[PDB]
Paper text:
[name] (a-subunit) and [name] (b-subunit) have similar domain architectures to STK_23000 and STK_22980, with high amino acid sequence identity for both subunits (59% and 71%). The recombinant protein showed broad OFOR activities toward pyruvate and 2-oxoglutarate; therefore, we designated this enzyme as StOFOR2. However, StOFOR2 has less activity compared with StOFOR1, due to its relatively higher Km towards both substrates. In contrast, StOFOR2 easily formed high-quality single crystals in solutions containing ammonium salts as the precipitant. We could solve the structure of StOFOR2 by the single-wavelength anomalous dispersion method using a selenomethionine(SeMet)-labeled protein crystal, and we determined the structures of the ligand-free (2.1 Å resolution) and pyruvate-complexed (2.2 Å) forms. A database search using Dali server indicated that StOFOR2 is structurally similar to MtOOR (Z-score = 39.1, RMSD = 2.6 Å, and Nalign = 346 for a-subunit, and Z-score = 21.4, RMSD = 2.3 Å, and Nalign = 206 for b-subunit) and DaPFOR (Z-score = 37.6, RMSD = 2.7 Å, and Nalign = 346 for a-subunit, and Z-score = 19.6, RMSD = 2.6 Å, and Nalign = 222 for b-subunit). We used the StOFOR2 structure to investigate its possible interactions with StFd because it has better quality than StOFOR1 at the molecular surface. StFd was modeled into the large pocket of StOFOR2 by aligning the two iron-sulfur clusters onto those of the Fd-like domain V of DaPFOR. Cluster I is located 14 Å from the sole [4Fe-4S] cluster in StOFOR2, and the gap is filled with loops near the clusters. Loops between cluster I in StFd and the sole cluster in StOFOR2 simultaneously provide a protein-protein interface and an electron transfer pathway. The loops from the two proteins mainly interact via hydrophobic residues, involving the side chains of Ile46 and Pro94 from StFd and Pro13b and Phe18b from StOFOR2.
In archaea, early branching bacteria, and amitochondrial eukaryotes, the reactions are catalyzed by a much simpler enzyme, 2-oxoacid:ferredoxin oxidoreductase (OFOR). In this study, we report the crystal structures of StOFOR1 and its paralog StOFOR2 ([name] and [name]), providing insights into the substrate recognition and reaction mechanism of the (ab)2 type OFORs from extremophilic archaea and bacteria. StOFOR2 and StOFOR1 possess domains III (1a–228a), I (228a–500a), and II (500a–627/628a) of the a-subunit and domain VI (1b–305b) of b-subunit but lack domains IV, V, and VII. The TPP molecules of StOFORs accompany a Mg2+ ion around their pyrophosphate group and are buried at the interface between the a-subunits and b-subunits.
Residue numbers in the entry:
A (entry chain A), B (entry chain A): 2 to 628
C (entry chain B), D (entry chain B): 4 to 304
Amino acid sequence: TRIVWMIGGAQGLGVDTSANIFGNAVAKAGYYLFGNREYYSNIKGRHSYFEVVISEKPIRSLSSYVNILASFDAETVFQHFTETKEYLIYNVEYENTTVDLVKSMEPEMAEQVKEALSKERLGFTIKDVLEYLKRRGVKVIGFNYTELIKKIADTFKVPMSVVERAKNMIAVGASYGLLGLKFDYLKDAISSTFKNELFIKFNTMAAELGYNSVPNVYKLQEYKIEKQRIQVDGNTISAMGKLAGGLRFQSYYPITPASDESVYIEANQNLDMIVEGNELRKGGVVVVQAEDELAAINMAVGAALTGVRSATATSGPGFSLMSEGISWAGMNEVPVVITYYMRGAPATGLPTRSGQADLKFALNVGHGEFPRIVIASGDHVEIFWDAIWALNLAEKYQTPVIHIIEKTLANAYSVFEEELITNRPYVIERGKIVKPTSDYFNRFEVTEDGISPRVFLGQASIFYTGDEHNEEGHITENSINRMKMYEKRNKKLETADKEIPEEQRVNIVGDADIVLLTWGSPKGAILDAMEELSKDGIKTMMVQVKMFNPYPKNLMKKILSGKSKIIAVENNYNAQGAEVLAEKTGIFATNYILKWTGRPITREEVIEGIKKILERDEKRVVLYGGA
Amino acid sequence: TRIVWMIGGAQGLGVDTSANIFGNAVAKAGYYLFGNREYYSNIKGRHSYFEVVISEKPIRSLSSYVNILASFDAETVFQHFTETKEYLIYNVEYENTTVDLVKSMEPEMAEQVKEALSKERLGFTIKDVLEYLKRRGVKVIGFNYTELIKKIADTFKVPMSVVERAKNMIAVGASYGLLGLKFDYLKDAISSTFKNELFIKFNTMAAELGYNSVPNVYKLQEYKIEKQRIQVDGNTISAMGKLAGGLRFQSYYPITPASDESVYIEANQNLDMIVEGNELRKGGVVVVQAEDELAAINMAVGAALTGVRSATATSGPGFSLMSEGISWAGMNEVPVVITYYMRGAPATGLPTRSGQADLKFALNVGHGEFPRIVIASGDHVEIFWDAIWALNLAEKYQTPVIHIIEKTLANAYSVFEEELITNRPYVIERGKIVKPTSDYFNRFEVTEDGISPRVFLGQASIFYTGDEHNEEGHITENSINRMKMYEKRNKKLETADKEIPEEQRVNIVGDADIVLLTWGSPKGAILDAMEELSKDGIKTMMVQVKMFNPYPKNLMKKILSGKSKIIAVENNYNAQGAEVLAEKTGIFATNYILKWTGRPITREEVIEGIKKILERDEKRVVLYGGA
Amino acid sequence: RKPVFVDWCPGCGDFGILRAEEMAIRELGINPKSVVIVSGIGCSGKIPHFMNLPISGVHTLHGRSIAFATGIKLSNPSLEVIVNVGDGDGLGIGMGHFVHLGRRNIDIAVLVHNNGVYGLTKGQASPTLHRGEKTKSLPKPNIMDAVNPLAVALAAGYTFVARGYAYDVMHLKELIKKAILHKGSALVDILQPCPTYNDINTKEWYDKRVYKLDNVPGWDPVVRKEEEAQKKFEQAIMKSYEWGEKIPIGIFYQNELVPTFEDRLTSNIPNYREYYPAKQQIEINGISTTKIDELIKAKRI
Amino acid sequence: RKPVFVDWCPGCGDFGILRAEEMAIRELGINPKSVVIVSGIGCSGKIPHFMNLPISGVHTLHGRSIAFATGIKLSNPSLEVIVNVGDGDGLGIGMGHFVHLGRRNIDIAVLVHNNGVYGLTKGQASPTLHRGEKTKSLPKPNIMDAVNPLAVALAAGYTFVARGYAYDVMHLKELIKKAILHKGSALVDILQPCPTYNDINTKEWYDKRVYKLDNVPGWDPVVRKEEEAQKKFEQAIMKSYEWGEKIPIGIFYQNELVPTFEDRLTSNIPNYREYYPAKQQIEINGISTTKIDELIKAKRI
Ligand SMILES: Cc1ncc(C[n+]2csc(CCOP(=O)(O)OP(=O)(O)O)c2C)c(N)n1
Ligand SMILES: Cc1ncc(C[n+]2csc(CCOP(=O)(O)OP(=O)(O)O)c2C)c(N)n1
Ligand code: SF4
Ligand code: SF4
Ligand SMILES: [Mg+2]
Ligand SMILES: [Mg+2]
């Protein structure tokens, strides 16, 4: 099974919490979830919406359609009706509300709504939306939310304004009812979420009222859960991976959607540790909220100099500000990880939306030549293992490492098996660290592999400088020292490229003549698209780059030789990952499926885009669905 | 003729001024010059040196050898003896000075000196250097600078400390004497440089003493100068071009070697203007010294919003700090030029040396996708015309334009014909500017070519925002507006790529099977290398890219088809210009000649590097000569 | 297209500031086409977009409004340039540019939306929130001391320093007017409730504490002669630290005797006020009007 | 290799500061291996490189020394972290980080080389040079007002604020010692001749004007009880503006009663002083020692 549920409502009404409760109930019944959060750059009043994919099997991607849309306002109907396939739950009070009276709605969206309705001769009221939907076989279930709220207020002998938010749980209880799962899971999910008896009980009544007013349509059965499951978002998973990887200093400046990572680290900063002779100790991660990103990068780089594993996290505007600091870290061969939560850009761009438009900037960030190791996670499990990897790469190659996690992954959450992130050893490789044998240590010894022996502040006299320098860290302009030291640093990347197996830099799935060349978050939608297409004769393979620098040049040349279709799928305009392949190997993608609107690429967008390329060879498919 | 003169001395002794006087004399005799300035990141005491190439024809490049080395200290002998071919002028007082007693000398240079001497069984004194040089047929002319200074002090009845700096003019007068040009040119050059009668007269006596103590060796004749000649450095020429191009606001933060550009603009900021009906008006360029580069970029971008032609200038560290601001300018479609004086990097790097290591960063600066138009000048005349071009490109495509001028060009100076920068019209194209017809103007109208009609602050109500926006400039997250507006901005680059002839984006010289693929400052050395090699049977052509974005993809594919040797010559480690060709076309250079030591690539380095590639196909030639 | 949803939380102090700023601009009679409101990033930063009048808005980068404003004003000094920044924006990331404006004394007004928090990123402590304070948005007490915007501005030194309150609109309006007319750099630190985050420094908390320096007999913050300047400055400093039960609002210091940056430019560019960069004619039929003849002549051999 | 040419102009004030700082570190008996000197970009910035002792140097980015220092000190608070910045570096480009240090009260000393100019880039006016001043390096009089580093530091608020003079080495040495021992963020603004650029504020100019607050009977800048704090602070402010014929040198303000950032971290991380980030054992034979079991358990279905 694969059922797509969505609810929506004005930011500030706790609808996100309602979505969480719904999901938590369905999950306890033994269904996997993949959920999303879509908000405006706004604290109150704009339209927010929450999509939850439900299945008995692991889910990997979102969908373009909604099976069940749950609503209690006019706006959520207007915003999603064109995607709604099977069931609308709505508020009968707004039947005569016309799209022009929804003031929180962007004018552009009001126009898109009017266009979709006018096109088939409908007017602009909710009632007209209902007809639009009945023409497509959608079943609509209208609630007098006002009467139900009056009833509950009455029962609990409070005024209506006290129980106004029960509207949310009526919409949720009716949705959950359609599924046919037993009420207790929802009742339990309500009791574990709200913190006071009155709120529990009146929300429980609200959900009962919804559940008992609708028929059991999807007839879902329960599954016993064999292996232990967890539910986590991207932010959180990066934090877990970093902590597992030994992080003990993080400096950050708040920015969406990066801040949540640091807030989680800080709330959990006192960690249990099993140390020498099996002693339980606690060890604190110092977390500093810097005053700006220039302070944040440089604080982390300074911390690394003491031998601590350090990192920061940011997004486009912040990352641009960090360029200088990253260059200094390159010059001074300082391990640091920068988690790049890549979002809708340029400038402020879409602070609450996603993108893949900053890859080549990351690959070339800051002045000078130095090794910028760059990886990108494609799904939630990869995020965990990639954060451990980043930290090991940084210390092994003594250089900044950029770990890209798109916003789409950061804020989405999924249910998966716990063992996927606990089943293997948490390896910490500290690289070429040594105990100095005197008071003065030459920090930048010139070796054949480029990697100089490393010591920490406090162990011996060492020198770092932004200027070109000799083996002692003293300012040196001499041409021959310059030649050697500048090469030594860049040789580290060649050593990395010999040491890291190319097979760890890509995930390859399938073996077929049509290649889906991607990186990052489209991985999921692509794999789900490949399965659907396979059932229909259409054979495809996925090549997903994980490490862009050092680039898996030879492996890529081998896998792509003699392929007739190489279709780059990315959330940017210039297909920057394809551009990097072309720089490194000479191989040009044949076609593109691109999306720059900020919303996740869906399974169906990939399926249809590929059909559109096989059927008529169009060069660039441009996607735009969502929100 | 081609004679290479060098003088050197401790920073703070006015040796730069001495070099200027020498050159100015030779020039008035009708010889062209190409000169250089090499200093440490230091105000006093480090070793500085000044190379001046002398010829009856225009000169394009520096040389690896020195014909005449003029010196008055030990250090200048030790620093340049291995390059000295025909004549050393030196101070007999330091004959027994050993390299270990030169405390201002970097330890690495002391080792290079000892190695070069030990290698043929010489010790480490100046006297040993003299033998080294006599083994190579060099003639040495030793002066008792102390006695000559005593004589002059005596003549003028002052103490010796008053006339100590005459040492400089003894070295200069002896050098100029060897050439055989008449004393009056030097006498005139002394009188026009120094500002008081006593300093004039005792420096004139110092130069006489030098001139009359040496034989006329090079027997140079005078040339009548037909067409008017000028002598200018790179900094200055960029300033001239900007002013000719209409610049009326520049904000900057001091950094070497960018500051001199702004200091010149400010000293000349009240410009004559021939305006409407042939009226003489003066118009001031506002020049602001910002508090940091973040202020500098953003001040200039704000200024552009009023319709002023605005720019800044910077180098690597500063440019890294400007990333964010450049991204905001991309998003808001703001014309601005950033003159990137590219220097020795990463971090502080080599603040007083050169490099080409930041090209791909420039091409990808800041988060998001937007048109970054990027050009690079290859010689002094190109700098002028390229600065006019940058400013027109910025207003025509409403986007940041990056004008790269390497340090090598910025600080070098040359004599050339004035008409090369006055002979054609100074064209100012303001792009798609209009008079608003009401109180409210939609700044970002979506058109087919991507370029929205432009109005200035004060003419009508307009809005700019860092966020994604609609045609009115108001914050808009709508997916379909986003799709359109994000594409519109990037479509401007495709329009640029259709509108700018590809032939204006490259200079091609010759037609041969061996290609020298370059950009920027190696142009000169390459052209001089091609002429020498041609005389010896070896046929080469130069392909010099001037505009990297939009890249001349089709022209480059055409010129390079069927070429068997494509040799990239660049002052970086990764041959970033070659990497860009490879990204855009699939064409890989066959061989490389690279230099990352900070000093200009010489004519001979190119000649020998190419011989070394024809004779034994070595993949990467690594250069390191100078300083 | 035509509507802009004013998307601030119902009851946000930003409504008062907007209302006050609009009214200041109207009552001064300034042509709105000539007014540019340069704003930062945050809830505060959205303000030009919500303006009723045909003013222009330039919504910038986080902490960079002052630098933009400087380029705008100096290129076209006939524009009336007002800067609206958040306290995190203006005094956190923008701190450096905030201080350097004081040294230049450019004729601009800077209005700081002082809510104690970063509203737009969900209410982290701003640089004005006191150490130990715990709003509903903070998991732990604020680990940071506050900076006093008025004291930093005085030390910087802004030539007009005032504090307003978003829930005394008439008073705030009159302060904004004076900050705009002041010849030089003016600060108005505006006390502004954020009901969503910051349940400490609320409307009722301030109503109870604020008093007007305007109602203090003989309070005169205007420097009229150079010898008054030091005493007026120290009296401003002292007052700027009054905080607990009593909170002063009004003008702390004003000195129109210091030359503006524009006055200093006029010393080097004598016709700047009459032929400023943005007024200049740089081409006639696409041919540059700038003469560089003399510049080139100076380099002749 | 082994020699470092001390490349400052003969007679530079930087020689005095170097001599004074070395001596402060020796006389305090601190193990030199544990001392980290974090320095900016400029002539000033070269100082760790020229140090006689086995101290460590970290030569950073222009205006960024304080941010580096913060990461260093908080990761390993057993290091004695001293910051040497130029006035352009520390108070121009680094202004924002300079002020924010005051709010944190990290246990660091900051020594500002106040020469009035950017020595290393050929003597442009620094943020301490007064408006109208024309050094030999300036084509026109300085268009900018100066900032008073001591007043900005107080408003920020640094908990130890002092001014020294590079040509009274013994005095400067003793100030550096006290700035190092002070529990919190300490500023020493050091008056420092640049003979190459700045032929105004020379050695002879200062010799003539400086007097010691130490020689002022009853001058007590030490806060010993909370109620003293405001008076001590205002007395510091007043004094910090004395300039023409008389220039005070010495300690303007010291308050060791404010918790350090390290004290505040200890509230959230109870064993921070005993098991700070840099001391922690993060692996045993290449296997992480960090347990995230409970973190993962909290996410179970
Ligand atoms: C360089 C950069 N870093 C971070 C951000 C994210 N950001 C946007 S608004 C904001 C804080 C807003 O607080 P304030 O300036 O106090 O305005 P308010 O929302 O409270 O009015 C932050 C941290 C950004 N846009 N740019
Ligand atoms: C981001 C950046 N911009 C500019 C520079 C160039 N720069 C180096 S030192 C300096 C000024 C030094 O002045 P100050 O900090 O007063 O130190 P001083 O030389 O006078 O001791 C400048 C502008 C740089 N290194 N980095
Ligand atoms: S969050 Fe605080 S500041 Fe932002 S709008 Fe809501 S109330 Fe106003
Ligand atoms: S320039 Fe001024 S500061 Fe730099 S070294 Fe020479 S004297 Fe000292
Ligand atoms: Mg705020
Ligand atoms: Mg200085």
